[PDB]
């Protein structure tokens, strides 16, 4: 689960495939300006430390 431990789950380091339940939800940029709202849980590897 996103936020919980193992939000990112790669088999190994080389493994291009993985499982990323991060609850990554993009939001629209504000007031006619170029940027990318990415609303996301900081990792369950950030916590767990």
């Amino acid at each position: 689960k996103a936020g919980s431990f193992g939000d990112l789950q790669s088999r190994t380091s080389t493994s291009n495939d993985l499982y990323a339940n991060t609850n990554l939800k993009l939001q629209r940029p504000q007031a006619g300006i170029v940027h990318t709202p990415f609303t996301q849980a900081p990792s369950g590897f950030e916590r767990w430390k």
Binding site: K1, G3, S4, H35, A41, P42, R47
Partner: protein, 325 residues
């Protein structure tokens, strides 16, 4: 540009022209409106807000702003100046610490004031982000075309200037700036008022027992607490404030989305914020049974949802709602 007594002027209590009064860390946007006793802005006469007039001597010095520094716990960011008054984006700080650089000297001024910046929202950040929702903060303007309030600004009282009281080779010798009004006598008996050009002093001799005064009320001042009253009168000089507090919508906070987890009439919520977030709810029965808790540490929480519904407020993120039949 008024001059007053700065409290911890580098060493200790000097008399800085940039003596800080009325610190206002009362808005939300990282901003403080400050009054120096110095009136930067245009010059003495007519040009260029971005120049710099403080008092050196009895006299102004209307020159360039080159190296202003407001600062606190960290160096602030200027926002705009107008009149005696500057707006600057600061972080929180136990104190406020201001200063320019004339060029020969640092010549700063510093003061105590409790500062914080809560953004408006149920998130208790320490600083405004780049993104998030906009919502109605309190904040000061960039601009000058401003009349929403005005503070009394009547005359200065006198000021000391013992550079005047020279010696006439045996007697203490007063002079005048430009024909200004010098209010004079000594502990001994001699001239008792002083409204004059350059006088001498028949009786006393010592500079340290005489009235070196400057009634120079050709230009009014701010009515600082660190001003001596102009005893004569409440002269005119009602004068605006530029930096009105306005209802700007700050670019503002947002807390990361929750992890909704189902149970039987129960919301488990593994939760993981960026900053301390005030969560709260309202069990919509006529039994309200609300809850409040600032959450900064990530926490799996629980909510006994009822049949009719509950609502859920992840910070200033909008309120959610839930059917738990």
């Amino acid at each position: 540009p008024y001059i007053a007594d700065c409290p911890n002027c580098g060493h200790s209590r000097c008399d800085s022209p940039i003596a800080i009064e009325e610190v206002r860390g009362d808005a939300h946007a990282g901003v403080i409106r400050i009054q120096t006793s110095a009136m930067f802005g245009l010059k003495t006469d007519g040009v260029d807000l971005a120049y710099m007039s403080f008092m050196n001597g009895k006299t102004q010095k209307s020159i360039k702003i080159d190296n202003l520094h407001v600062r606190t716990s960290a160096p602030c960011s200027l926002v705009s100046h107008h009149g005696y008054y500057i707006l600057a984006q600061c972080p929180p700080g136990d104190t406020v610490t201001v200063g320019f650089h004339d060029g020969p000297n640092r010549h700063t001024c510093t003061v105590a004031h409790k500062v914080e910046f809560r953004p408006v929202g149920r998130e208790k950040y320490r600083h405004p982000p780049e993104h998030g929702v906009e919502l109605p903060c309190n904040r000061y303007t960039h601009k000058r075309a401003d009349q929403g309030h005005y503070v009394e600004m009547h005359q200065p009282g006198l000021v000391a200037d013992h550079s005047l009281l020279s010696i006439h080779s045996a007697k203490v010798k007063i002079t005048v700036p430009s024909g200004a009004q010098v209010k004079y006598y000594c502990k001994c008996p001699d001239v008792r008022e002083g409204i004059t050009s350059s006088d001498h002093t028949t009786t006393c001799t010592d500079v340290k027992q005489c009235r070196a005064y400057l009634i120079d009320n050709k230009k009014w001042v701010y009515n600082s607490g660190r001003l001596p009253r102009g005893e004569g009168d409440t002269f005119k000089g009602k004068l605006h404030v530029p930096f009105v507090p306005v209802k700007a919508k700050c670019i503002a906070t947002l807390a990361p989305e929750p992890l909704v987890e189902h149970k039987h009439r129960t919301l488990i919520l593994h939760l993981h914020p960026d900053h301390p977030t005030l969560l709260t709810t309202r069990s919509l029965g006529s039994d309200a049974n609300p809850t409040r808790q600032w959450i900064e540490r990530p926490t799996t929480v629980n909510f006994t949802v009822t049949g009719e519904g509950l609502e859920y407020t992840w910070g200033n993120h909008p309120p959610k709602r839930v059917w738990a039949q």
